[PDB]
Enzyme design. Sequence first.
Site, PDB file in Angstrom:
ATOM      1  N   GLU A 120      24.432 -14.845  19.279  1.00 29.36           N
ATOM      2  CA  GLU A 120      24.205 -15.318  20.640  1.00 29.36           C
ATOM      3  C   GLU A 120      22.742 -15.662  20.878  1.00 29.36           C
ATOM      4  O   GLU A 120      22.439 -16.590  21.635  1.00 29.36           O
ATOM      5  CB  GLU A 120      24.660 -14.260  21.649  1.00 29.36           C
ATOM      6  CG  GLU A 120      26.166 -14.024  21.695  1.00 29.36           C
ATOM      7  CD  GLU A 120      26.935 -15.170  22.333  1.00 29.36           C
ATOM      8  OE1 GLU A 120      26.299 -16.141  22.793  1.00 29.36           O
ATOM      9  OE2 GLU A 120      28.180 -15.095  22.374  1.00 29.36           O
ATOM     10  N   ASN A 176      -0.731  -6.881  21.598  1.00 31.80           N
ATOM     11  CA  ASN A 176      -1.202  -5.512  21.409  1.00 31.80           C
ATOM     12  C   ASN A 176      -1.855  -4.933  22.660  1.00 31.80           C
ATOM     13  O   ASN A 176      -1.713  -3.734  22.919  1.00 31.80           O
ATOM     14  CB  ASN A 176      -2.174  -5.441  20.223  1.00 31.80           C
ATOM     15  CG  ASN A 176      -3.433  -6.261  20.434  1.00 31.80           C
ATOM     16  OD1 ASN A 176      -3.487  -7.125  21.310  1.00 31.80           O
ATOM     17  ND2 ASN A 176      -4.448  -6.004  19.618  1.00 31.80           N
ATOM     18  N   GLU A 235       0.838  -1.190   0.000  1.00 27.34           N
ATOM     19  CA  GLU A 235       0.000   0.000   0.000  1.00 27.34           C
ATOM     20  C   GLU A 235       0.883   1.252   0.000  1.00 27.34           C
ATOM     21  O   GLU A 235       1.863   1.308   0.751  1.00 27.34           O
ATOM     22  CB  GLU A 235      -0.932   0.007   1.215  1.00 27.34           C
ATOM     23  CG  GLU A 235      -0.242   0.069   2.583  1.00 27.34           C
ATOM     24  CD  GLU A 235      -1.209  -0.137   3.733  1.00 27.34           C
ATOM     25  OE1 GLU A 235      -2.430  -0.204   3.485  1.00 27.34           O
ATOM     26  OE2 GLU A 235      -0.745  -0.232   4.890  1.00 27.34           O
ATOM     27  N   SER A 253       4.058  -8.020  11.021  1.00 26.74           N
ATOM     28  CA  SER A 253       2.968  -8.432  11.901  1.00 26.74           C
ATOM     29  C   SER A 253       2.074  -9.397  11.141  1.00 26.74           C
ATOM     30  O   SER A 253       1.540  -9.040  10.085  1.00 26.74           O
ATOM     31  CB  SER A 253       2.169  -7.222  12.386  1.00 26.74           C
ATOM     32  OG  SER A 253       1.061  -7.626  13.171  1.00 26.74           O
TER      33      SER A 253
HETATM   34  N1  LIG Z   1      37.650 -11.984  35.790  1.00 27.09           N
HETATM   35  C1  LIG Z   1      37.040 -11.553  34.456  1.00 27.09           C
HETATM   36  N2  LIG Z   1      36.137 -12.359  33.906  1.00 27.09           N
HETATM   37  C2  LIG Z   1      35.550 -12.028  32.713  1.00 27.09           C
HETATM   38  C3  LIG Z   1      35.887 -10.893  32.090  1.00 27.09           C
HETATM   39  N3  LIG Z   1      35.170 -10.817  30.949  1.00 27.09           N
HETATM   40  C4  LIG Z   1      34.392 -11.909  30.872  1.00 27.09           C
HETATM   41  N4  LIG Z   1      34.623 -12.659  31.957  1.00 27.09           N
HETATM   42  C5  LIG Z   1      34.047 -13.977  32.392  1.00 27.09           C
HETATM   43  O1  LIG Z   1      34.519 -15.107  31.417  1.00 27.09           O
HETATM   44  C6  LIG Z   1      33.206 -15.683  30.810  1.00 27.09           C
HETATM   45  C7  LIG Z   1      33.410 -16.113  29.347  1.00 27.09           C
HETATM   46  O2  LIG Z   1      34.643 -15.518  28.823  1.00 27.09           O
HETATM   47  P1  LIG Z   1      34.584 -14.526  27.495  1.00 27.09           P
HETATM   48  O3  LIG Z   1      34.013 -13.175  27.900  1.00 27.09           O
HETATM   49  O4  LIG Z   1      35.931 -14.344  26.972  1.00 27.09           O
HETATM   50  C8  LIG Z   1      33.530 -15.271  26.188  1.00 27.09           C
HETATM   51  P2  LIG Z   1      34.531 -15.439  24.582  1.00 27.09           P
HETATM   52  O5  LIG Z   1      35.167 -14.136  24.260  1.00 27.09           O
HETATM   53  O6  LIG Z   1      35.591 -16.491  24.751  1.00 27.09           O
HETATM   54  O7  LIG Z   1      33.459 -15.903  23.285  1.00 27.09           O
HETATM   55  P3  LIG Z   1      32.706 -14.869  22.368  1.00 27.09           P
HETATM   56  O8  LIG Z   1      32.744 -13.486  23.029  1.00 27.09           O
HETATM   57  O9  LIG Z   1      31.295 -15.298  22.188  1.00 27.09           O
HETATM   58  O10 LIG Z   1      33.424 -14.798  20.928  1.00 27.09           O
HETATM   59  C9  LIG Z   1      32.392 -14.714  30.890  1.00 27.09           C
HETATM   60  O11 LIG Z   1      31.019 -15.207  30.913  1.00 27.09           O
HETATM   61  C10 LIG Z   1      32.779 -13.976  32.335  1.00 27.09           C
HETATM   62  O12 LIG Z   1      32.232 -14.750  33.450  1.00 27.09           O
HETATM   63  C11 LIG Z   1      36.815 -10.069  32.652  1.00 27.09           C
HETATM   64  O13 LIG Z   1      37.125  -9.026  32.091  1.00 27.09           O
HETATM   65  N5  LIG Z   1      37.383 -10.395  33.824  1.00 27.09           N
HETATM   66  N1  LIG Z   2       1.581  -2.603  18.414  1.00 30.13           N
HETATM   67  C1  LIG Z   2       1.373  -2.095  17.201  1.00 30.13           C
HETATM   68  N2  LIG Z   2       0.666  -2.816  16.259  1.00 30.13           N
HETATM   69  C2  LIG Z   2       0.452  -2.303  15.022  1.00 30.13           C
HETATM   70  C3  LIG Z   2       0.938  -1.049  14.688  1.00 30.13           C
HETATM   71  N3  LIG Z   2       0.583  -0.791  13.411  1.00 30.13           N
HETATM   72  C4  LIG Z   2      -0.111  -1.848  12.929  1.00 30.13           C
HETATM   73  N4  LIG Z   2      -0.205  -2.787  13.921  1.00 30.13           N
HETATM   74  C5  LIG Z   2      -0.871  -4.096  13.825  1.00 30.13           C
HETATM   75  O1  LIG Z   2      -0.696  -4.654  12.538  1.00 30.13           O
HETATM   76  C6  LIG Z   2      -1.860  -5.365  12.167  1.00 30.13           C
HETATM   77  C7  LIG Z   2      -2.005  -5.439  10.651  1.00 30.13           C
HETATM   78  O2  LIG Z   2      -0.726  -5.417  10.054  1.00 30.13           O
HETATM   79  P1  LIG Z   2      -0.545  -5.138   8.478  1.00 30.13           P
HETATM   80  O3  LIG Z   2      -0.442  -6.418   7.684  1.00 30.13           O
HETATM   81  O4  LIG Z   2       0.693  -4.298   8.281  1.00 30.13           O
HETATM   82  O5  LIG Z   2      -1.849  -4.292   8.057  1.00 30.13           O
HETATM   83  P2  LIG Z   2      -1.912  -3.536   6.636  1.00 30.13           P
HETATM   84  O6  LIG Z   2      -0.536  -3.212   6.108  1.00 30.13           O
HETATM   85  O7  LIG Z   2      -2.750  -2.287   6.762  1.00 30.13           O
HETATM   86  O8  LIG Z   2      -2.652  -4.576   5.655  1.00 30.13           O
HETATM   87  P3  LIG Z   2      -3.827  -4.057   4.683  1.00 30.13           P
HETATM   88  O9  LIG Z   2      -5.133  -3.817   5.412  1.00 30.13           O
HETATM   89  O10 LIG Z   2      -4.040  -5.109   3.621  1.00 30.13           O
HETATM   90  O11 LIG Z   2      -3.357  -2.773   4.047  1.00 30.13           O
HETATM   91  C8  LIG Z   2      -3.012  -4.647  12.847  1.00 30.13           C
HETATM   92  O12 LIG Z   2      -3.988  -5.565  13.276  1.00 30.13           O
HETATM   93  C9  LIG Z   2      -2.376  -3.938  14.028  1.00 30.13           C
HETATM   94  O13 LIG Z   2      -2.828  -4.485  15.250  1.00 30.13           O
HETATM   95  C10 LIG Z   2       1.650  -0.319  15.630  1.00 30.13           C
HETATM   96  O14 LIG Z   2       2.088   0.792  15.342  1.00 30.13           O
HETATM   97  N5  LIG Z   2       1.868  -0.845  16.886  1.00 30.13           N
END
Ligand SMILES: Nc1nc2c(ncn2[C@@H]2O[C@H](COP(=O)(O)CP(=O)(O)OP(=O)(O)O)[C@@H](O)[C@H]2O)c(=O)[nH]1
Ligand SMILES: Nc1nc2c(ncn2[C@@H]2O[C@H](COP(=O)(O)OP(=O)(O)OP(=O)(O)O)[C@@H](O)[C@H]2O)c(=O)[nH]1
Lengths: 427, 427, 426, 426
Positions: free
Chosen positions: B244, B196, B61, B130
């Site tokens: 993650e 909602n 639209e 949505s």
């Molecule tokens: N004593 C400290 N412990 C730390 C520190 N930073 C993290 N950690 C602890 O070690 C835990 C895991 O180690 P890492 O932060 O190195 C996770 P890693 O980098 O090996 O993997 P990704 O970041 O997902 O690539 C982490 O959950 C903390 O409990 C730090 O600066 N000092």
């Molecule tokens: N929480 C929240 N919900 C929204 C918002 N805007 C739309 N919605 C929800 O989106 C739903 C419909 O999504 P759409 O598929 O995008 O509706 P549309 O694009 O107008 O589809 P058409 O009627 O065919 O044009 C509605 O029932 C709303 O409840 C918003 O700003 N906040």
Amino acid sequence: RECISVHVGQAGVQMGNACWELYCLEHGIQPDGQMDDSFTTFFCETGAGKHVPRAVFVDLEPTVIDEIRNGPYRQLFHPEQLITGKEDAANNYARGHYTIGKEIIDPVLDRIRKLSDQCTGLQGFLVFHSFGGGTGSGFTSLLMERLSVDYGKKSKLEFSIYPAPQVSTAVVEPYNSILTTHTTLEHSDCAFMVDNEAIYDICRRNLDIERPTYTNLNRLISQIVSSITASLRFDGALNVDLTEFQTNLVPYPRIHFPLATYAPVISAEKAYHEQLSVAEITNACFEPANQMVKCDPRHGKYMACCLLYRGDVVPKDVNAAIAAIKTKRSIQFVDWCPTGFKVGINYQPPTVVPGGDLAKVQRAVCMLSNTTAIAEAWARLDHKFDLMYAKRAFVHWYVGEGMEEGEFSEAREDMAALEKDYEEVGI
Amino acid sequence: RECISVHVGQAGVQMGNACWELYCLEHGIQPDGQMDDSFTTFFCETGAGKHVPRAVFVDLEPTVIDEIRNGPYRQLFHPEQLITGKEDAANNYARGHYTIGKEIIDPVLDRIRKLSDQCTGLQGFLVFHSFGGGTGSGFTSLLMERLSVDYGKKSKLEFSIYPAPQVSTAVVEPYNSILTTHTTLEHSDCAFMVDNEAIYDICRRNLDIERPTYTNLNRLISQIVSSITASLRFDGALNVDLTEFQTNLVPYPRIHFPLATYAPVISAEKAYHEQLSVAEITNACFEPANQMVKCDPRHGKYMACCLLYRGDVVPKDVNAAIAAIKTKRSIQFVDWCPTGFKVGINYQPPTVVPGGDLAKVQRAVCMLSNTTAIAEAWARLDHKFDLMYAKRAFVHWYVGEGMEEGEFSEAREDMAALEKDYEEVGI
Amino acid sequence: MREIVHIQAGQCGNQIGAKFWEVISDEHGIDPTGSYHGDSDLQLERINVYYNEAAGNKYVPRAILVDLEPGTMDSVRSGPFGQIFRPDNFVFGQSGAGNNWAKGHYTEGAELVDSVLDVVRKESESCDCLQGFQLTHSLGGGTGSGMGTLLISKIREEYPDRIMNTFSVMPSPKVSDTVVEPYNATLSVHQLVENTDETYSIDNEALYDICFRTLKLTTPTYGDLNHLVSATMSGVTTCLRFPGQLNADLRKLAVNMVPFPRLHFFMPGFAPLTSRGSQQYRALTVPELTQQMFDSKNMMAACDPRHGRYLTVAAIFRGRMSMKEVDEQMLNVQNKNSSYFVEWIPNNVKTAVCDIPPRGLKMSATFIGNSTAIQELFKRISEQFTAMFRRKAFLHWYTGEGMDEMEFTEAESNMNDLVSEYQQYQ
Amino acid sequence: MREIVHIQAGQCGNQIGAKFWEVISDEHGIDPTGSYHGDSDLQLERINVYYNEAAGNKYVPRAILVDLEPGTMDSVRSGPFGQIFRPDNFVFGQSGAGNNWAKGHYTEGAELVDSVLDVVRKESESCDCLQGFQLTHSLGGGTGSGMGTLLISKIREEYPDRIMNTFSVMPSPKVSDTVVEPYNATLSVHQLVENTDETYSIDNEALYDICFRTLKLTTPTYGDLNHLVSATMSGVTTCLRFPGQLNADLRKLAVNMVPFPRLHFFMPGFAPLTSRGSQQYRALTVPELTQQMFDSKNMMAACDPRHGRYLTVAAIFRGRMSMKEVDEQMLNVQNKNSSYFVEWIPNNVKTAVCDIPPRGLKMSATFIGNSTAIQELFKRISEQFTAMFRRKAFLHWYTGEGMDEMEFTEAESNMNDLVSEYQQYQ
Ligand SMILES: Nc1nc2c(ncn2[C@@H]2O[C@H](COP(=O)(O)CP(=O)(O)OP(=O)(O)O)[C@@H](O)[C@H]2O)c(=O)[nH]1
Ligand SMILES: Nc1nc2c(ncn2[C@@H]2O[C@H](COP(=O)(O)OP(=O)(O)OP(=O)(O)O)[C@@H](O)[C@H]2O)c(=O)[nH]1
Ligand SMILES: Nc1nc2c(ncn2[C@@H]2O[C@H](COP(=O)(O)CP(=O)(O)OP(=O)(O)O)[C@@H](O)[C@H]2O)c(=O)[nH]1
Ligand SMILES: Nc1nc2c(ncn2[C@@H]2O[C@H](COP(=O)(O)OP(=O)(O)OP(=O)(O)O)[C@@H](O)[C@H]2O)c(=O)[nH]1
């Protein structure tokens, strides 16, 4: 102790302006053309307080030649040495040889004679070119033939920019390289090769330049060509002449294809953080990715390697360093030449360009080595040639110049002999 | 580190304009389209002193798309990214998929390719939509299928606005939700849901706003979607990436339906009187009425909960806080994953919009958690679907688009499989 | 002269590894840029054992930072001592693992190990005679558990004879910072039990408990916890960095503390731990340090030493002190508490002292303990591993990279094996 | 120094030829009168390669305008750069052909070719060493198809060794501006396939498709379409007009792109193509230009390159740029899309760059592509030719000038021949 140089094609003069500016700043030569024995081997003495190089820039296309005439290095070079043509080679080995080559070689032939007659210590010749295009294939192959019958005994050091496995600037370069190599096999005493993507890999991982240009590629190349002749310029504890590269690196009269690599190549900030000594550069120069060609040395065997250092480097650590290289079992030397080590030294250190990408270093080395590693490269170039040759592609241009399909078969079987020669010699 | 976004339907771009204005004010980006590494993950750098977001607004639209073209945030976004159609979905899963979907997806497909090719640190995709309407059901289900076969390995973070038990904007939304969930079950890595009427209850009792609008609903929702990616933008003592949320929250490859809740949500006058620390917000985020879905967590069991704080919060009290949550016997964790706690921190605090309903807070948290509490919700949506499906009501429009009654049964039995999977896994 | 090459893995290993270079830079008098500004001449006497000399009297550390995400290097490079490290050593990937051991070991690890093995090869060739390697990682997550465990196997293949030290922080049940922690811990210990010859069991739970009781820190951050573990890494390598009356290299302590090939999981500690507001009300001679070292609430592990018996103990000392008070104090701790020490070894204490203490302290020591009470932390993660594994929960992510289901059971066969070893000698 | 002599034919060839001199006059800094007002000295360095010097620092173009009708010259002479052309070169007839190839080739052409051959002979003697000729015409109509194809055969007789370039716009099925278009297209290609060594297949349909998608022009005129095709003619002759890191003359691109004597019909393109209302929200570095160059909706031909395979590609560049990003980008487009490139050539890309870009842009390039997908545009005009020829329709006008019916069949024999050539190498 003198030597004449010649530059051919777009590749030739583009590094020629980049190398000679490195040569002039070493000997204190200003770009305007003036400031005892170190500069005599490249630069003459024009009367009093003026010099000129012992080289010539030749190229058929006039865009690059006139750029030197309108460039900053105008007064340094001779006006008449900047030879220019009138019709382009256009990636054609034949067009720069037979039609357009004949009407320009005659000014080129007699100029080398008078340029050598005034000289008295002519060691040899070294030509900078590239078989990856049209001008560096045909015209370069013609001039070497006509002076070989004249001189013959003098050496010839070729410097070509070969194509990569996959990266390539042209599309007809297998035909340009396969034809010109048929003439290069018998008259070239030695030919150092460089790859176009490999030198990009040098400045990518080491010099951390993500966006360089061809100007930067010529700077480190100028360090290579200047370092091999650095022993002749300045004094050294173990002097090596230009004919050292012929006897010590050519095991057989047809196998005359060494490689080239240079180290250290460090940025400005990394130069202060990274130590410079003989040990790390020796391990770095034999590193495979640090070479200027995309060929694995592990697949082949080193016939011989010619080391040549610069700067304050004592002869103790260079001997102890290569002794460690002999103990490394990752590499493998051939049984036909175990003691394939030739080391040299020059007291004058590596220079530095103002504003250049290369940083100052107190010592460096330029390592040349022959091997069967490029045997697969010639097989690769021959294999892709068979694909287009089987379809008879790009043939109407070469025969459109004057040639025929006959010598195309002569170049194919010549490479076939060359391929098996690397296989049988490497046993 | 980069991530591409996409907005679909009336629900998508309505929060997209509300979220991206929150993104730009954090990085100092003015609405006119200009002011080092924190903004690179959403905003590019176009030449010099100009940026553009890494997102696209697509909707059939044209009323909402052209409102952005004539709205205040005109110069910030790309004119070409504001994609618009010519025929509305009209609460039809099929009309935005087969008839009208096919003639618009091809501009949408190739745009994501070139948008990713220029990028290099693409982590994944996250789509805001949505299933309660027509455009967010059919076209969203189609685009995720076509890029899943292309990419596949990259993550997909869905953000849908589901209907409440009793409150509802449409009348055909069970058919719209039951059909699009048949495709979402196999290709969606994770899908955070929001109700909602629940978000109305958030601003009713806590923020004391008796008469809000959808603009206010998107502000606190923008805090949720911005806080989950806040670790990638700014530095944090314990960084958490976009992947993650896939490994730590999805116990089984089909059960990929977490929940979402956020705290603190305090007005301006109440913020100065109410103390802000880790203890009260941790007890408030696990409060059942403070969740964004009308499903009792006491009926089910938490499979795993992913905590992620912001602002100056040391890692001592966050560990001591969750240790008190483990001692609470009112909640009940499942035996299949006792250590279902994943805590994160980001030094950059929660921002504040000028003139927005949310007040400034020195720290906040965005708690995502999976559970079997929505098992009754899928049973509730399936139960009301059986009432209209038994009478074959609202069926002549879907088959009037091109579909038939066959896949209507496939979506029913798929929910029947999905219902018992929550029952057996929760033992 | 026994050069040690540093290596880092995971986010925590880069953080505590960064703090390790920071604390030792102060006692050596190394500038943040790299120049020397110390006072004592002995600092340059063994500066080569960790650092590399350079021009301008500059010293660059022999460190290799490895992390699969690029953001970790940006924080370390932008730190106080971020610029001293070499730029070339900052090797890293682009797409993180996201707490997945299979990614960092099989798919995302195989593309990066070729880029780090050549770097450490360059560093290993630069030194005269390398002794061993010391690594910092965490059993939790995927980067430190995946990347670290992988290259430990490769370094063993390349350097099987050298010492392989590891400083590995393990999870805890109360402080759970990752949902997939027991799988990563169970898969990592299969490599740590067989490859490395030494291991330091550090706990994050005790690193918070230690700060409340003696430091009295009201707002402790991760940087404060890094100060405790970074000082422990400095104490183990003191005698080769500065002279001492009794030298104890990394091998000299390993032979005494590792009585069997698989029994090498130590338990660290540090002293003197005292707050700033109660420094004047305490002495600094040797007997107060001895009773503080063997105290249960002093170590940075969550294990109860009273619930078991110490196999062997090693207490490296620093600074000038009397030897009679040192030797006599170690006699009574093992004699009065003979029940908490194994009778099948005549002496469970390894003594060693240095003359150059840290700056700001005159007498200090670091604890290294191998005890049968370590099994209680291994079975609880095994129970969390077996509880989640029996229904095959959180395994579909690991099989996508090509990992086999039996490899989790092979790790489970190793998990109940190592805890049974300490039960044999209890 | 490789002078190129311009030549025009037909109404469209004079219009796009007029635009060609206009766009290059701006970058060279040439006034509408003829004097120089540029800034860079390199503009005069190769001004002789298209222009002729004169007194008062004036430069006259080396153009020859040929059109059978007189009103075409009145519009060109009254243009912005109409006065710069030589008045003697404005040769023209009186009675137009009215979309009749037989008139402009046999009867109305024979009386004028004697008046143009002596003029171009005079221009060829003025330069030092000519390289070749470039022509602009259209396959539709009678003037550009009749007059242009005739003198191409005569110039081949007079200059068989020089390069013979041609920029020929062909018809399209959906956009049909002439009822007798396929007969003129079928009769014209018989001469273009054998005489000229190069040919650029331009389409008017794609020139309308290209302006909607990226330029967003609401009211495009023919002058806007002339700007696109005129820029392409400037890119092909850039390296000889200004220096560059890698030069590529008109012969240097012909030898790479023309693998066989008859296969010389290229497919042009140009980039960057971006509207004024979206110029700020787009970058200008090399990778965005590469993907835009090889895009299917970028070229000014109606051919689908996805339905075939490229024989060879040539991408002339302009402006200072990095060579690594240029070379590396051309590797992936041929590797990631190897199915759409012939395997019997190892490399289908020809690279070349210049340092002096156009004014108003910092980086730009022109596409030249020879592909097997060109046949789909040749068979449809052949089908329209064979559909109209089988009943001998619209031939009585051609036979009145003495044209033989078999010449239409001889052209038909060439028509299905060239499409079969591209089918061979597909
Ligand atoms: N004593 C400290 N412990 C730390 C520190 N930073 C993290 N950690 C602890 O070690 C835990 C895991 O180690 P890492 O932060 O190195 C996770 P890693 O980098 O090996 O993997 P990704 O970041 O997902 O690539 C982490 O959950 C903390 O409990 C730090 O600066 N000092
Ligand atoms: N929480 C929240 N919900 C929204 C918002 N805007 C739309 N919605 C929800 O989106 C739903 C419909 O999504 P759409 O598929 O995008 O509706 P549309 O694009 O107008 O589809 P058409 O009627 O065919 O044009 C509605 O029932 C709303 O409840 C918003 O700003 N906040
Ligand atoms: N891109 C452009 N295309 C044009 C332009 N003018 C014409 N054309 C197209 O070229 C088609 C035929 O080209 P011409 O206009 O030159 C017909 P010509 O002059 O050669 O014959 P007569 O006018 O009958 O003497 C024509 O039908 C248009 O589709 C123009 O200015 N720009
Ligand atoms: N590495 C490197 N290679 C270069 C450089 N300049 C040119 N080349 C290579 O040289 C090859 C062509 O060499 P030439 O024969 O001199 O090309 P040319 O002189 O322009 O020949 P024409 O096209 O006929 O004018 C190209 O494919 C380039 O890869 C340079 O500066 N550095």
